[PDB]
């Protein structure tokens, strides 16, 4: 029998590491049916903020308007998604946006040749002014009430060194970008994770003793610390299994044909989450779990 | 199409979560049916995917002018040694998992980078 | 034409690393692999996006209609 308590007794989590961008952890004694649900929800269901509507006023660069708006949308924005609400696509496009669901970005820039460029100089930054348009150039225009709600933390790109465009003197770019909430299911730009995925814990069943110098080459057919040499007798054993990338170099030699079987632990998922920059991977996982729970709760409360 | 006459129309744009994912977290941008090869017999695409994966790993480029490899210096052996010395599989296979259900696929998937 | 904002396969923002890759290649005598590793690109899906970028926009820019030549 399976019960809530019979799962809660055996389920355990090991947070191997955690930065503000990447968190590598474990889910043990859970089924792939749920680990994959978590992975899918993280990749394509956690809301985020990216530029959606772009209002070009003047553009003369080599980059055409569609490509420029595409890049501006693709730029991740360090905004906490909870700070703003969702947009009603049924409403007219005049009143479809407000100050609590849309963040406004602007990019007004004109290139001009620098008169102080030394003779023989070929560096574009020396020759021209604003020859490069960076994501940091996207100013934030707080509107209405959001001027004091976002005062605690201004809106900036996650990576302000993204090369949005290049200019030459005379050429200018002027636009406004509207950033709304969205999920990676609609467009890949809204996905908060660079990539979230798991991998079954490798399992290395050593069938027979591998004493001798055969252990030296046996360990040599693995990542550096996967296998250790026993201190007392010259036997081989598995130090760490997470360290193994499953490359099967062992099976490539006729020596270990009947000395080891490589398998996996189907209840042991080594999750790996990297954030785009708007949120932290622990919060990404928390959001995914809350999303699955609230989806099931919505189905419960749905009259039939 | 690839550079080996392997044309084919884009059938459907598969969602990324539904795409199979590998142990390294990458999801291919192109899925090519394994049944394209037995009749067309473009082994060059296989060896190119091998060499492209190895080059993208090591940060190098490999020449593919015909007739540099011969019956002894097999390109499979060459680029397989290069693939093994970066931790990956000598045959270019990658343990991948199904993104639809979640379970691991039956065999190692053959992945690589091709132009 | 110009460096893509994100990696195609995973989505790791590689659009802010082209200038740094060029600097690590030019100033230091780094190999492309060493420079990409020191740039924070581990998956070869992300490595290829900077290893193989061509940057045709610089060639495009030499034809400026709005500046006397």
């Amino acid at each position: 029998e399976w019960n809530v308590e019979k799962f809660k007794k055996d389920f355990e989590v090991n947070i191997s590491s955690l930065d503000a961008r990447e968190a590598n952890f474990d889910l043990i004694n859970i089924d792939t049916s749920i680990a994959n649900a978590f992975r899918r929800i993280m990749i394509s269901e956690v809301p985020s903020v990216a530029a959606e509507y772009v209002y070009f006023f003047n553009n003369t660069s080599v980059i055409q308007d569609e490509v420029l708006a595409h890049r501006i949308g693709l730029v991740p924005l360090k905004v906490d998604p909870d700070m703003l609400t969702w947009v009603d696509s049924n409403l007219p496009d005049d009143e479809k946006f407000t100050d609590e669901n849309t963040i406004v970005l602007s990019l007004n820039v004109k290139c001009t040749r620098n008169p102080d460029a030394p003779k023989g100089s070929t560096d574009p930054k020396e020759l021209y002014n604003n020859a490069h348009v960076y994501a940091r150039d996207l100013k934030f225009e707080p509107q209405g009430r959001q001027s004091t709600t976002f005062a605690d933390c201004p809106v900036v790109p996650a990576d302000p060194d993204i090369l949005l465009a290049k200019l030459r003197p005379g050429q200018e770019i002027s636009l406004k970008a509207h950033c709304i909430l969205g999920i990676g299911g609609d467009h890949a730009k809204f996905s908060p994770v660079s990539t979230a995925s798991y991998r079954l814990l490798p399992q290395i069943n050593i069938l027979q003793p591998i004493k001798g110098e055969s252990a030296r080459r046996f360990q040599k057919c693995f990542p550096p610390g996967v296998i250790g040499i026993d201190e007392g007798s010259d036997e081989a054993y598995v130090k760490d299994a997470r360290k193994d990338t499953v490359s099967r170099e062992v099976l490539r030699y006729e020596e270990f044909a009947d000395k080891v079987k490589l398998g996996r632990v189907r209840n042991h998922f080594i999750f790996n989450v990297e954030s785009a920059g708007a949120m932290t991977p622990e919060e990404i996982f928390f959001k995914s779990v809350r999303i699955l729970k609230n989806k099931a709760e919505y189905l419960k409360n749905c009259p039939i | 199409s690839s550079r080996h006459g392997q044309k084919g129309v884009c059938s459907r744009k598969w969602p990324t979560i539904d795409m199979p994912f590998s142990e390294t977290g990458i999801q291919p941008d192109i899925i090519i049916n394994p049944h394209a090869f037995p009749s067309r017999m473009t082994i060059g695409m296989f060896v190119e995917s091998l060499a492209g994966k190895a080059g993208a790993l090591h940060g190098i480029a490999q020449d593919s002018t015909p007739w540099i490899f011969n019956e002894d210096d097999t390109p499979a052996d060459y680029f397989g040694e290069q693939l093994a010395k970066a931790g990956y599989n000598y045959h270019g296979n990658e343990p991948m998992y199904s993104g639809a259900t979640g379970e691991e696929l039956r065999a190692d998937i053959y992945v690589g980078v091709v132009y | 034409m110009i460096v893509p904002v994100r990696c195609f396969s995973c989505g790791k923002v590689v659009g802010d690393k082209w200038e740094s890759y060029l600097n690590l290649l030019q100033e230091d005598e780094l190999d492309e692999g060493t420079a990409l590793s020191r740039l924070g690109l581990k998956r070869y899906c992300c490595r290829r996006m900077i290893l193989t970028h061509v940057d045709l926009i610089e060639k495009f820019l030499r034809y400026n209609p709005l500046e006397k030549r």
Binding site: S16, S17, N24, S197, R199, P223, P224, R242, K243, D244, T245, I270, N272 | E23, T24, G25, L57, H58, G59, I60, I68, F69, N70, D72, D73, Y78, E81, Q82, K85, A86, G87, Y88 | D31, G33, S37, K42, Y44
Partner: peptide, 19 residues
Amino acid sequence: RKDVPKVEGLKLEHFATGY
């Protein structure tokens, strides 16, 4: 015939997640 020259300085560029 001279065999295709093996590249040098080749090291493990791939490691399991979290390492």
